[PDB]
Design a protein around this ligand. Structure first.
Ligand SMILES: CC(C)c1cnn2c(NCc3ccccc3Br)cc(N[C@@H](CO)[C@H](O)CO)nc12
Lengths: 65, 279, 286
């Protein structure tokens, strides 16, 4: 009767996008503009922009109407 | 996200034949209503398509010279609105000149490009009285356009997937030394893609990837390994074959697209003015 | 149209809400931008903890939205005194809110208007995020967001300092304020001005240092504040257990980057410990 977390399983119909925390370690962030100190202070990081861009690049790539 | 969007669920169609069926049905419904109200006046669906292509080009011209500078995503949303509206409506019932302006208006609103109505209508190359008249027409047609879109306002453009593919290529495809030299030509190809029915038949990611690989082929650079290795298509060869077929059919779509001709455009415009005056 | 009006529910500045025969209808610039925002966002979302948009209609620039009717809201639950808020009920409310927020953030949408009256409850005990009139898509660098969003009592400190670019931290700080309201049955930080809100935040939780918020001084409306020790959280919430304190501290971290996301909060031990969240059917009905 307790709660066990289960990740949101939504089909993207495309290649798997690397996790947000791994973008810097995998080298993606070297190809997106660095976030300004004001951006970081507000909580906005370049990882978010990179993750969104990759997710939209890979979304529905394997989908046939 | 596109993968569970209304664009994929309701506005990406199986074939060009289905789009032709929808357009022909719209034309036939208008003909039935005009005859049941009480002749060479009516336009045929191919003439409707020619007029729609011409007025999409005018919509692009309007959005290009729009001050303040229209974001490219707003222009994409407006063009998608125009295509979707004239998938199920005829240029004889609703004039494309007003519908394109209404599409741009609704796109500016939906894409959070805050522009006041007076400064929206100030971009029209017309005297002020025409600008107020056009504003009233746009306000009248805004709800009609929204209803005809089935209240599906979020449009997924290929531009952000294009940026994501460029990031992925820069990170994981060192064979492509500088992916940025692909952008310009790819952008060009994207524009041509926008003139066809591809936005109604293919996912934005597929469109962006096809544009990128067409640019690469035009540059002489071959990137089969990016699909097979980087994109994980060597484990599933069938999916890779389907992707290749999608891209080839998209290139054929761009190849067989026909821009409207000026004389045919003028004749059809005069015919459409006749239709709207008689109606 | 098909709907015939039956009762009057509420009224806001943007719109007036009435119950109609059972649904709820919310009523030179053209169609209202807030209504278009709600339509365009709710058409792309389908989650059990996000309110669904059944239909819309209107005449010319006028437009009305149709939603499924919700029986109550978290504000009425919190303000009610005949109702006892057990840790299980609180956990269930937080769980549903966080599941809806995790789905919403996964699709790169910030609610930016989270508050107890915008968390609606149906007769089946399902909590739904509503009032997406201020919701916006985040993650795009070339998208300036105003900081007027979120009602002051739930506004995150980064917003109060003028943060134009932000992420899910605003929603998570609002969620922390909602949790504090659930625990105390009163608003946590009832500021009457932006300066007063910042003062209450820095006095209850201590003025954040340059180590708790590295670029704090770079924000547009940043104002140097006197140093408060901050009340220990176990004194504020005496009945709360250590797991709940861990969750609250995560939700109320001053660095928005370090502030726990909806997924991270869902993975916290507080939700997996016993007692489990009460089923929606057994949730309190005012
Ligand atoms: C509009 C739609 C999302 C909806 C459906 N139900 N519902 C309720 N039901 C709770 C209730 C029921 C009966 C008597 C009193 C209350 Br209270 C409140 C509400 N609040 C509105 C304004 O009323 C807030 O400004 C923003 O959510 N919106 C809605």
């Amino acid at each position: 009767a307790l709660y066990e977390y289960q990740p949101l399983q939504i089909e993207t119909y495309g290649p798997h996008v690397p996790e947000l925390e791994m973008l810097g370690r995998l080298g993606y962030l070297n190809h997106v503009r660095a976030a300004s100190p004001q951006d970081l202070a507000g909580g906005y990081t370049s990882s978010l922009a990179c993750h969104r861009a990759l997710q939209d690049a890979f979304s529905g790539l394997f989908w046939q109407p | 996200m596109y993968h569970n969007s209304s664009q994929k669920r309701h506005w990406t169609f199986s074939s060009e034949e289905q789009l032709a069926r929808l357009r022909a049905d719209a034309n036939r419904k208008f003909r039935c209503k005009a005859v049941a109200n009480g002749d060479p006046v009516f336009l045929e669906p191919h003439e409707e398509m020619t007029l729609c292509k011409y007025y999409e080009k005018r919509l692009l011209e309007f959005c290009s010279v729009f001050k303040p500078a229209m974001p490219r995503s707003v222009v994409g949303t407006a063009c998608m609105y125009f295509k979707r509206f004239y998938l199920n409506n005829s240029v004889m019932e609703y004039h494309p000149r007003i519908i394109m302006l209404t599409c741009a208006f609704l796109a500016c609103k939906v894409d959070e490009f805050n522009v006041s109505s007076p400064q929206f209508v100030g971009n029209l190359r017309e005297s002020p009285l025409g600008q107020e008249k056009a504003l009233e027409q746009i306000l009248e047609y805004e709800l009609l356009l929204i209803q005809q879109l089935n209240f599906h306002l979020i449009v997924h453009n290929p531009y952000r997937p294009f940026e994501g593919f460029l990031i992925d290529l820069k990170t994981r495809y060192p064979i492509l030394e500088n992916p940025e030299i692909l952008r310009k030509t790819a952008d060009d190809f994207l524009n041509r893609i926008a003139l066809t029915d591809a936005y109604l038949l293919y996912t934005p990611s597929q469109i962006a990837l096809t544009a990128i690989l067409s640019s690469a082929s035009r540059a002489g650079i071959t990137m089969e390994s990016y699909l097979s290795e980087s994109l994980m298509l060597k484990e599933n060869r069938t999916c890779l074959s389907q992707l290749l077929d999608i891209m080839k059919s998209m290139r054929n779509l761009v190849k067989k697209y026909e821009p409207p001709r000026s004389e045919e455009v003028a004749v059809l415009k005069q015919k459409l003015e006749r239709c709207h005056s008689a109606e | 149209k098909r709907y015939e009006k039956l009762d009057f529910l509420g009224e806001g500045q943007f719109a007036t809400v009435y119950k109609a025969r059972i649904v709820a209808i919310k009523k030179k610039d053209g169609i209202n931008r807030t209504a278009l925002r709600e339509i365009k966002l709710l058409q792309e979302l389908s989650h059990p903890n996000i309110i669904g948009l059944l239909d819309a209609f209107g005449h010319k620039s006028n437009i009305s939205l149709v939603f499924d009717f919700m029986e109550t809201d978290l504000e009425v639950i919190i303000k009610d005194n005949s109702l006892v808020l057990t840790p299980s009920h609180i956990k269930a409310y937080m769980l549903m809110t966080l599941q809806g927020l995790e789905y919403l953030h996964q699709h790169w949408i910030l609610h930016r208007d989270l508050k107890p009256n915008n968390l609606l409850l149906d007769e089946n005990g399902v909590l739904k995020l509503a009032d997406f009139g201020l919701a916006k898509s985040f993650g795009s660098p070339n998208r300036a967001y105003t900081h007027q969003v979120v009602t002051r009592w739930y506004r995150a400190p980064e917003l109060l300092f003028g943060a134009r670019m932000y992420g899910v931290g605003v929603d998570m700080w609002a969620v922390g304020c909602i949790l504090a309201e659930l625990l105390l049955r009163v608003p946590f930080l009832p500021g009457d001005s932006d300066l007063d809100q910042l003062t209450r935040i820095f006095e209850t939780l201590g003025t954040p240092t340059e180590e708790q918020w590295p670029d704090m001084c770079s924000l547009p409306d940043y104002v140097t504040f006197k140093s408060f020790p901050g009340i220990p959280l176990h004194h504020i919430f005496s009945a709360a257990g250590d797991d709940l304190l861990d969750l609250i501290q995560g939700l109320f971290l001053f660095n928005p980057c370090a502030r726990i996301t909806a997924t991270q909060a869902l993975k916290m031990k507080y939700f997996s410990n016993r007692p489990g969240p009460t089923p929606g059917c057994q949730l309190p009905r005012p």
